[PDB]
Design a binder for these strands. Structure first.
Lengths: 119, 45, 109
RNA sequence: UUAAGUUAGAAAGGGCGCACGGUGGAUGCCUUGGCACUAGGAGCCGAUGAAGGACGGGACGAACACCGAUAUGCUUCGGG
RNA sequence: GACCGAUAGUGAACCAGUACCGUGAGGGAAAGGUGAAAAGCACCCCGGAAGGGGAGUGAAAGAGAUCCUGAAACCGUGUGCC
RNA sequence: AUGAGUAGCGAAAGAGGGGUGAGAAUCCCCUCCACCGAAUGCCUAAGGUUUCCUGAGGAAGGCUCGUCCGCUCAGGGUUAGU
RNA sequence: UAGGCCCAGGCUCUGGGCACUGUCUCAACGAGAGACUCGGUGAAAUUAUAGUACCUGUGAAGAUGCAGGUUACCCGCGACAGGACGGAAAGA
RNA sequence: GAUGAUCAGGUUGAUAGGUCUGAGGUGGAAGUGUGGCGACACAUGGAGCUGACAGAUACUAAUCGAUCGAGGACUUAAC
């Protein structure tokens, strides 16, 4: 099935949306191991939506991506980055746009940490 | 639910026999000689 | 043989002995890696004591850092500090903040 | 080789003894303080402001002790 | 002083009628010991520090600041026999 | 000492990037997200008595941590004929 | 967020009818908090010592510890509530 | 499956995710065009969307490694 991640039904959705947008922005994220394991699927689905490029997929993506700035130099939205920069980079891959690398335990709570990045 | 009697030393030591830690699973980094957890990362290794 | 002791360390002895049992008897170079990769709160302290013992072995007795092994490794009890009123947030009484003396001895094999 | 018999050793941990430590302040030595008396003194202070205090005073923090805007001291007469 | 010697002797050998408790009258503790002399650890090493290991002082450093002696409960490490 | 590394550690929304630093889940900044709004807002009493500001700090204390604090230490700070 | 209706008598009480339902026939699934595992911290009641099986008897109250027999490799973790000479109780 | 445990796999491989194609569920998406004063209706068009289900596909992750684990006692008898 799917993990509940210790949240309620709405907080889980909010954290997933936030992490997806953050990974789109920064190209590489550090978070817990299970959060990355659950984030992989949604971020790959949104990359798949961006690879289409039509208006319908653009609005489906917009109904889930946060309103944040990718880079201030060109006044570029995260959605614009998704549909212009990444979709062009992964034009030949059939799936598997991410990779998780395990780091080790956190000091505060012993949680297992992991880096999730775009290939 | 009240301890009828104190616990002797020998019984305490016997109960504490499974309360111990495990040696970690460590491999040596191809480049470098650092040791990391298996399936963990260390290019900086 | 060389020794290094850490006195009145703010850690419960029973929790430090769990790691002390892991590392004793091992070669001194391998032991550091185990301490680095164990996720316990006594590891950093025991690692500092072990590094101090290794240092004394080279700067004071001119023994080599290789060919060194952990001979003795134990944890003793230190003076206990008594907090009589954890009434702050807690409803408990006379909490005991325990303490430890950590000792490590190394020698040549 | 087969069959039928005997025993040994094994320690995850534990028990007894021994060696070595930690903690904790009994014990032993010691005395700055007390207790019970003895022999002498002296048995009142105060509106010319008492007993007891508050606040202050040092080159530089707080406190004790000393002192009172002449404030960590003034004058005199003696001792040293 | 055929009186006590730090749980004793005053409640008080130590900044004690203090700290604390109570609205108040009032109740009322705990707590002595480095060394002959600070000569109280320059300097080197590990460590952010604390704390250690050398070096040095000292008769003694296992006399290093709750620093004379240091028992028992309690907590550990090694090992002979089961 | 035992119970025992046990019961606790209460609501209630956070996530990432950067910084500082020996060390970051917990401190600072940014971004988005979320909660109150006849209050969880503004002022001003009673009461408290320096808790206020700046720098330093990592003994102790803060139900975890701590580079942070109502904690510690040095300097400062309160102006009326209405 | 915010009352179930109607027909009665007696002044609020007793009614009656309807509506409605997990009250139950009889329970099933789902959400959260705790439980559980991992990292940090960390108490209390209680406590003669203890390597502390069961049955049938014996016995100053009711046998783990007395006699005779029957069973049982060493050490844990999670549950149950049987004993708990646990506490509540209360008759009396 | 509380945790241990059990079971399927670890790059001569389909273990899980992704992708592609399906199964089932909901039910006629966005944009555009048309009709209407308007709320709306029709066409494009069983359309769009789709967690835990199936088959292909090494695209991503199961890397490298480390540890443990025998050398088979004696007696008698039949061979």
């Amino acid at each position: 099935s799917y993990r509940k991640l210790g949240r309620t039904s709405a907080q889980r959705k909010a954290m997933l949306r936030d992490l997806t947008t953050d990974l789109i922005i920064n190209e590489r994220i550090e978070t817990t191991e299970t959060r990355a394991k659950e984030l992989r699927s949604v971020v790959e689905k949104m990359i798949t939506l961006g690879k289409r490029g039509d208006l319908h997929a653009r609005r489906q993506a917009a109904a889930y991506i946060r309103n944040e700035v990718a880079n201030e130099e060109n006044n570029q939205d995260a959605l614009q980055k998704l549909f212009s920069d990444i979709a062009t980079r992964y034009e030949e891959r059939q799936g598997g746009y991410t990779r998780i690398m395990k780091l080790g335990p956190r000091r505060g709570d012993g949680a297992p940490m992991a880096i999730i990045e775009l290939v | 639910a009240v301890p009828f009697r104190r616990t002797s030393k020998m019984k305490k030591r016997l109960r504490r026999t499974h309360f111990k830690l495990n040696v970690p699973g460590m491999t040596e980094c191809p480049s470098c000689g650092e040791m990391k957890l298996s399936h963990r990362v260390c290019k900086a290794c | 043989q060389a020794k290094a002791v850490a006195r009145t360390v703010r850690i419960a002895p029973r929790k430090a002995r769990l790691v002390m049992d892991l590392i004793r008897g091992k070669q001194v170079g391998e032991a550091v890696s185990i301490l680095n990769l164990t996720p316990r709160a006594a590891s950093p302290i025991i690692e500092k004591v072990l590094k101090s013992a290794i240092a004394n072995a080279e700067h004071n007795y001119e023994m080599d850092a290789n060919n060194l092994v952990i001979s003795q490794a134990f944890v003793d009890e230190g003076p206990t500090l008594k907090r009589f009123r954890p009434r702050a947030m807690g409803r408990a009484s006379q909490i005991n903040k325990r303490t430890s003396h950590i000792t490590i001895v190394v020698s040549e094999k």
